[PDB]
Enzyme design. Structure first.
Site, PDB file in Angstrom:
ATOM      1  N   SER A  51     -51.933  40.772  -8.448  1.00  0.00           N
ATOM      2  CA  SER A  51     -52.811  41.618  -9.373  1.00  0.00           C
ATOM      3  C   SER A  51     -54.297  41.180  -9.409  1.00  0.00           C
ATOM      4  CB  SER A  51     -52.118  41.433 -10.744  1.00  0.00           C
ATOM      5  OG  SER A  51     -52.509  40.033 -11.265  1.00  0.00           O
ATOM      6  N   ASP A  52     -54.990  41.883  -9.466  1.00  0.00           N
ATOM      7  CA  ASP A  52     -56.268  41.441  -9.950  1.00  0.00           C
ATOM      8  C   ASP A  52     -56.447  40.550 -11.182  1.00  0.00           C
ATOM      9  OD1 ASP A  52     -59.253  41.188  -9.708  1.00  0.00           O
ATOM     10  OD2 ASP A  52     -59.751  43.203  -9.195  1.00  0.00           O
ATOM     11  N   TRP A  53     -57.427  39.790 -11.436  1.00  0.00           N
ATOM     12  CA  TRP A  53     -57.376  38.801 -12.648  1.00  0.00           C
ATOM     13  C   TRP A  53     -57.509  39.636 -13.806  1.00  0.00           C
ATOM     14  CZ3 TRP A  53     -56.609  36.977  -8.459  1.00  0.00           C
ATOM     15  CH2 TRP A  53     -56.663  35.621  -8.011  1.00  0.00           C
TER      16      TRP A  53
END
Ligand code: BR
Ligand code: BR
Ligand code: BR
Ligand code: BR
Ligand code: BR
Ligand code: BR
Ligand code: BR
Ligand code: BR
Lengths: 713, 713
Positions: free
Chosen positions: B240-242
């Protein structure tokens, strides 16, 4: 029965004669049709009791010769507003009325089939025949045509919808190859014709001049048989446009039953006599008698219902006066009020300074087969006289003499009429007129016609320098005094509007309203008529903004092909989807009163969408309101326009405080998009957008489609 | 094997730890990763010999802390040109080289996975992160990413392509719902990622922040499983993105294997510790251990090949000097010459008057996770000094003092740096400079960064009044003398160009070239470098011309959704199809020399299209030529863009008179359009358009597809 009776009687050559016209009547070596001026006739076969059937133009009213040689009698016709103005009414009922009036005339002058309505899409404003087409939208166009056709055919005569299909430019129309995706065809260009064919059942269809995807439309089997018949269930016959195509037998094989006008060798040294060529092909087995039979049957199945077949005695004396009232009504509801900064209607007293050479040279409609010859045609000036409005008489005399002077001058005499200079008035002379008068009214006029496309140049799409000079000057001096200025657009198609509209206070789109023009215009100024028309086409801010940029094809000066790069994104579909702002949007039009929309209820039962809403007259003058229901389909699988017009309605004449209940039904099949193979109604959430125009949405609701639906034609 | 070995050893809780990051290192309560500055780490499991794996940014070069507390050592990185400039090279080979250099650094600093490249489409110029994306075209973007990924992963470390998918704006990216038709997805937005996944096999993919059609991308099963895996055959893992998404277990069910950075409760008071929540869901049967197993397997199948897994001793001392040469090369080929009215390159003698505050405040790249911290960054001025060019020293001193003065002033000091006034020079002072000097060189600079979109306002997309004042004034006075003016565009994304470009003689698009910027720029002025770059994105005449008008969504100030109304017609696809003229078109770029195209031969065997043509250097200086092959598919069934880029090529460095043979192959599947259900290659005639840009077509040929071809994913 009776049809199959005659068919079994006909000899081979009689069958051939029947599928070809007798040549263009009254021209070349050809005898006048019994109805002089008629566009064409079929071959009689007295034997089995077959009469010559008569075909005549056209969309703006019956076009026949008023006088006949060695004849004391008269044969004048009602010249109706042009189709783009009829479309601006957004009124089905009215279109049906227009159809009945034209229909009666057609019947009583001994004509069997009227060549109308024309219903090609407004792909591009420059198209020379836009004035005699309805709309850039297939629903508006198809609905209008259907209503017109029902009207015409309630009178025992035939309507002929044209031109099938994609005849959207005049440039090289007889040769140009029109390249169109099947999707654009089915969603935009065929779509209107589909609606008309299924809802009104025209006796006949006229195949277009142009090629479609490599094949002349009059020789296109996919179009005339597969689409027209096998899919849509057309049960009339197809005739060719005048001299269209290049092969008579290919025309019959494709499902083009009646070749018109016949004797094509009379205008093209290269063509053979079509009867000779067909007889030869049957003789050689290039054409089978079975195919010939199906053509003749298609024609006969229809024309045995024509008045000519039953030896109908026509009076040659329709009720012109009753019809003129219909033409006036048509125009009254078709004028579009574009701008009104407290300028209209004019006060009772108001003393009018009338500008523009077109106040006298009023354009009643474009030229070509869509032209008409009425007993009279009321100009804008004459209309104002007749109504006894307070106009500057000294100015009117000034114009009258100016026009006559230069119409007799070498550079400005008819051959067509050269465009006259509009800035002949001194800056000082206009100053005086501004002190003397109460309001200024400026007529700017445009004309087009079959066979010529317009150019994006001054004096055409754009105002000529002298016109913008006149408007700038009149505006300045009348605004110097605390006085208003009004422009009347006596045009057949969009013109540039942005550069000058802020200079003026009012703008009436009067289009070209036929014989009653001046009368309609005067009654609109005075407020006797409350404008209720709305645009059937988009007015672009500038010509470069229009999506159909390839017009008129490649190469530009002698186009051999033109591809519809913009595809389904034509008209408002383009402007909405890609966020280009029009000068005036599709379905826009103002009123001398105000309306309020309310009580939206949308329901979908899986087969029918139902939109209900209330419209109340919230102003101080009686009026009609055109409402528009656009559907915004979900993005889902395939790309779709921002929204699409699916239904519309025009309220009765509502007095202040009055309201009406609007109930519209849309079949689920009309919610579909074409994906190249099938019509698909995608599942998901849909938006209902009820607008006073395509951009003025007064009510919004959603509904949901639970299960996707598919339709393979 | 080894993977399935470890898997059978892991306890339930160890499996859970493995799919969640350990929190953002060095921030909040969190310990620095062993590689301080790293974006994140995985949980170690010393038991079965699992190490903490290290993830680090970013697209412009390895982003880590240069210094470490209690450390005598240094950890500087090479700061490469930004991706939009890399893309401007149109050079796969070079991109592969850039990847290897970054790759070596990544390996030697103890990093396992590099978070690059970013490859979202340039839907709209205003997007804050356009600078770190390649192109508005999926072929250019996908090809560039593939080449970069092969490079990185030749070095024993992982690449991570991002952000999947349709992360095309910064505004409300963590919440906004992106509404996109499946057709636009497959043809434009997914298309680049598809190419990269299939051609380069990245170790990992990073799911975007935004929702796609109702579902967070990190929680979108259709995207992460059905498309990514079942259709494309992806065999890496997805992270996942942050802090993206809002449900950890939904992330794992969708095929998002690694949740990053972990401890989301540290920035969002509402989130739970992701390990707690997952343990709970397994406990309650909301999540099965089988699904957990597949996630852990996906991660492990990849990371057992990482250097960390094999206890690799990294040197913490990569070859910076060798890599700086690669960064210089990258920039050299990525500068775009936009305009040259006999102005470049500058004569040996030429005495340069250097204008623009950005000559000293040179922008090396945008801000955010794509930022870098190099040991140095050569400004435009310093570059000119270093090369010993003939610049006005008095002027340079004038600027130096001006900048420092106001950077210390309250209104213009860092917090981000406020934009400084550019017109501080007297009209008279510029007159003198024009008499003294030979040429003028004007630097105008722009910066953007993650988290902020640009606005269509002056000082941003448009020149501020002071900038246009400066250019107008310098232009006038230098043109007063018979002297030339040059503008350097030190920008990360398109700016308005039309209003002022006719005032100047030369225009170099220098973008933002990283640490070697000044050096590259100087060498381009002097002609040591012959510009060979071409636009990867369209420069619109005005912002209102761009098709993605809905940017950044509704409501504008706090967008909850944004629908891609323009759909597949994005970038040059829009401008070509609907006849809107760009300021500078996709794939445009000039050279200090000329090239001539010839000997076109196209052949199609039913499975492969082959385009062959010769390119000869027809000028007086050695150079490279980027050539572009666009296919114009027939209209056929469904609407299609005017043309589509299907292949491209960059010649070797050709000396005058030299030529090269260009042979390109295109698989028939790449000729397809998506109709909502299937990819279709329609039968009919196709045009091959070999261009020096999308509008400068030098060669045309046709080929034919005999039988339609279909592909259901
Ligand atoms: Br049409
Ligand atoms: Br207005
Ligand atoms: Br007109
Ligand atoms: Br064309
Ligand atoms: Br994307
Ligand atoms: Br230029
Ligand atoms: Br920027
Ligand atoms: Br939106």
């Amino acid at each position: 029965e009776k049809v199959n009776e005659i068919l079994s009687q006909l000899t081979l050559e009689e069958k051939v004669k029947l599928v070809v016209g007798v040549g263009l009547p009254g021209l070349f070596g050809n005898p006048h049709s019994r109805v002089a001026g008629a566009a064409g006739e079929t071959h009689p076969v007295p034997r089995v009791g077959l009469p010559a059937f008569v075909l005549a133009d056209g969309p703006a009213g019956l076009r026949i010769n008023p006088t006949r040689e060695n004849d004391e009698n008269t044969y004048y016709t009602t010249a109706f507003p042009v189709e783009i103005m009829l479309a601006s009414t957004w009124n089905r009922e009215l279109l049906e009325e227009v159809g009945k009036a034209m229909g009666e005339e057609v019947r009583e002058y001994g004509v069997d089939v009227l060549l109308a309505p024309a219903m090609n899409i407004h792909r591009n404003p420059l198209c020379g025949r836009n004035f005699e087409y309805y709309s850039e939208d297939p629903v508006l166009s198809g609905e209008m045509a259907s209503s017109f056709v029902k009207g015409v055919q309630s009178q025992g005569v035939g309507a002929c919808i044209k031109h099938f299909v994609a005849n959207n430019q005049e440039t090289n129309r007889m040769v140009v190859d029109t390249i169109v995706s099947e999707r654009a065809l089915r969603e935009i260009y065929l779509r209107g014709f589909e609606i008309a064919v299924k809802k009104s059942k025209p006796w006949s269809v006229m195949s277009a001049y142009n090629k479609l995807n490599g094949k002349y439309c009059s020789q296109n089997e996919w179009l005339l048989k597969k689409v027209l018949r096998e899919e849509w269930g057309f049960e009339g016959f197809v005739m060719s446009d005048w001299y269209a195509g290049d092969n008579p037998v290919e025309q019959l094989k494709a499902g083009n039953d009646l070749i018109m006008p016949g004797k094509a060798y009379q205008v093209n040294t290269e063509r053979r006599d079509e009867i000779e060529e067909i007889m030869e092909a049957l003789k050689e087995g290039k054409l089978s008698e079975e195919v010939l039979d199906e053509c003749v049957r298609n024609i006969l199945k229809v024309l045995v219902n024509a008045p000519s077949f039953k030896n109908y005695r026509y009076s040659n004396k329709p009720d012109l006066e009753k019809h003129a009232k219909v033409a006036y009504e048509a125009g009254a509801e078709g004028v579009v009020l574009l701008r009104n900064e407290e300028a209209l209607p004019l006060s009772e007293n108001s003393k009018i300074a009338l500008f523009g050479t077109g106040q006298i040279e009023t354009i009643k409609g474009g030229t070509g087969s869509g032209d008409t010859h009425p007993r009279y045609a009321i100009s804008i000036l004459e209309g104002i006289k007749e109504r006894g409005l307070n106009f500057d008489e000294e100015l009117a005399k000034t114009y009258e003499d100016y026009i006559k002077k230069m119409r007799e001058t070498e550079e400005y005499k008819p051959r067509i009429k050269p465009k006259l200079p509009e800035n002949f008035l001194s800056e000082k002379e206009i100053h005086k007129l501004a002190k003397k008068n109460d309001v200024a009214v400026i007529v700017i006029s445009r004309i087009s016609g079959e066979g010529y496309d317009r150019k994006p140049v001054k004096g055409d799409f754009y105002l000529s320098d002298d016109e913008t000079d006149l408007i700038k000057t009149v505006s300045r001096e009348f605004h110097e005094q605390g006085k208003k200025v009004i422009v009347l657009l006596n045009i057949g198609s969009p013109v540039e509007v942005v550069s000058w509209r802020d200079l003026v206070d009012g703008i009436l789109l009067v289009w070209q309203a036929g014989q009653e023009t001046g009368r309609i215009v005067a009654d609109v100024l005075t407020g006797r008529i409350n404008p209720s028309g709305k645009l059937p086409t988009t007015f672009p801010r500038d010509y470069s903004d229009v999506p159909s940029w390839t017009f008129p094809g490649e190469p530009k000066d002698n186009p051999q092909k033109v591809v519809y790069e913009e595809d389904i994104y034509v008209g408002y579909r383009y402007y909405d989807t890609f966020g280009v702002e029009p000068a005036y949007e599709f379905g826009y039009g103002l009123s001398y009163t105000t309306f309020e929309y309310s009580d939206l209820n949308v329901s979908f039962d899986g087969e029918t969408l139902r939109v209900q809403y209330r419209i109340e007259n919230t102003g101080g003058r009686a009026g009609k309101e055109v409402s528009q229901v656009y559907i915004k389909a979900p993005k889902g699988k395939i790309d779709k326009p921002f929204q699409e017009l699916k239904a519309f309605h025009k309220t009765r004449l509502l007095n202040p405080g009055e309201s009406e209940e609007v109930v519209l039904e849309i079949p689920v099949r009309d919610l579909a998009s074409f994906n190249g193979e099938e019509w698909v109604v995608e599942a998901g959430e849909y938006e209902v957008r009820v607008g006073a125009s395509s951009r003025n949405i007064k009510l919004k609701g959603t509904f949901s489609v639970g299960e996707e639906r598919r339709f393979k034609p």
